[PDB]
Design a protein around this ligand. Structure first.
Ligand SMILES: CCCCCCCCCCCCCCCCCC(=O)OC[C@H](COP(=O)([O-])OCC(O)COP(=O)([O-])OC[C@@H](COC(=O)CCCCCCCCCCCCCCCCC)OC(=O)CCCCCCCCCCCCCCCCC)OC(=O)CCCCCCCCCCCCCCCCC
Lengths: 69, 36
């Protein structure tokens, strides 16, 4: 026959884990989607020789678009 | 040899109380009242 199981209160641990997951996801799902969109539709730069008489900007020496930004 | 009358009576009273306590640990047919 079914008996009551004496346990410590698990409500507060569960609520804390839910809150931490919610806030981490709230900020990091947009970041993941944005990174994926940037990677797909604005890829990395390809290496090229510096053209004659041209002096590049300091951010033009990096290839990832996020690092360049 | 054996229990003293006080020992035996105290054991019987504690036994009755403990058995009622264990009986009260049982669940009625609806105890897990789960919210929607
Ligand atoms: C949860 C809460 C609880 C608490 C937990 C604690 C959490 C704490 C969090 C703290 C904050 C976290 C911040 C961390 C920062 C890190 C971010 C970062 O820098 O990302 C870098 C990196 C992105 O790289 P990049 O430098 O930006 O891009 C360079 C390239 O140019 C790009 O290459 P590309 O452009 O050519 O690829 C295309 C593009 C898109 O990909 C594609 O489109 C192609 C994919 C291939 C698919 C191919 C087939 C699929 C389709 C087939 C079918 C359709 C076609 C046919 C249909 C017809 C059918 C008949 O690829 C991407 O853009 C990758 C997506 C990036 C996502 C990274 C996620 C970072 C999020 C930051 C915050 C995190 C918050 C957590 C929550 C996030 C959500 C969970 O991200 C990754 O590394 C992703 C992982 C990839 C690894 C692949 C797996 C290989 C593993 C092998 C080793 C394992 C061996 C076994 C182990 C041992 C076991 C025994």
């Amino acid at each position: 026959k079914r008996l009551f199981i004496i346990k410590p209160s698990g409500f507060y641990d569960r609520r804390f884990l839910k809150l931490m997951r919610f806030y981490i996801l709230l900020t990091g799902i947009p970041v993941a989607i944005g990174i994926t969109l940037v990677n797909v539709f604005i890829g990395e730069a390809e290496l090229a020789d510096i053209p004659e008489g041209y002096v590049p900007e300091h951010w033009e020496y990096f290839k990832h678009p996020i690092s360049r930004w | 040899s054996g229990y003293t009358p006080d020992e035996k009576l105290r054991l019987q009273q504690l036994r009755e109380l403990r058995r009622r306590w264990l009986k009260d640990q049982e669940l009625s047919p609806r105890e897990p009242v789960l919210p929607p």
